[PDB]
Amino acid sequence: GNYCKRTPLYIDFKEIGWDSWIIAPPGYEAYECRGVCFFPLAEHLTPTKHAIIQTLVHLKNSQKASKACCVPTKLEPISILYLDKGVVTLKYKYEGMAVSECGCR
Amino acid sequence: GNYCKRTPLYIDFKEIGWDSWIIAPPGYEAYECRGVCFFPLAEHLTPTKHAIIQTLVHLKNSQKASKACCVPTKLEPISILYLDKGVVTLKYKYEGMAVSECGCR
Ligand code: NA
Ligand code: NA
């Protein structure tokens, strides 16, 4: 089923309104994290102790706390070519842009 | 309204069955993170670039990606007295247990 995992998400810079300064790429594979954090929390989702205990509290009481959340736990940079006061400029490592790993938190 | 923040959450170890191996304390203030991540994402929620972009894509297209999630971004230890493979063990800082900061991710 839809257990927590990384899934595809292509973002075109026109959607976010950044085509005003970004020249290239026109968009990028950003990925996203979707799905449920189900007990027992799988090791590959690197759950914290708090996420484990919150999940267990909620498992037997759905009106107390809530499920752990599927979120990015590791992000990767991309390169962007952009306009810096009208001068074409390249940043090789624009950090925090694409998901490489997901986890329950 | 219900913006992402830290909220109280007391966890009695009995209610999760961890009293089988945790001798003391009987429970602790674990806290939890609750609420929505609304654009513009407030700076105190330390949003990543991915969280900002995902939120913006979702803002004008509710059927693409999703909202960023309110999760713990800093966890604190507690002291516990417990049984480890059948011997009473003391650990002054059992890490990852109590929320001290929340953020949007
Ligand atoms: Na792909
Ligand atoms: Na697109």
Numbering used by the authors:
A (entry chain B), B (entry chain A): 320 to 424
The study reports:
BMP-9 and BMP-10 are TGF-β family signaling ligands naturally secreted into blood. They act on endothelial cells and are required for proper development and maintenance of the vasculature. BMP-9 and −10 are synthesized as pro-proteins and processed by furin to release growth factors comprised of two cystine-knotted protomers that can covalently homo- or hetero-dimerize via a single cysteine in the dimer interface. Unlike other ligands of the TGF-β family, BMP-9 and −10 are secreted as a mixture of disulfide-linked dimers and monomers, in which the interchain cysteine (Cys-392) remains either paired or unpaired.
Attempts were made to crystallize BMP-10 and obtain a high-resolution structure. While BMP-10 crystallized in many conditions, none of these crystals diffracted to high resolution. A chimeric BMP-10 with five surface residues replaced with BMP-9 crystal contacts (N357F, Y358F, A374T, Y409L, F411Y) was purified, crystallized, and solved. Unfortunately, an analogous analysis could not be performed on any BMP-10 structure due to both limited resolution and local disruptions (caused by pH, type-l receptors, or crystal contacts) in BMP-10 crystals. As such, the extended analyses of BMP-10 are limited to disulfide bonded cysteines in published structures, and it is not clear whether differences in these structures are due to deformations caused by local disruptions or fundamental differences in BMP-10.
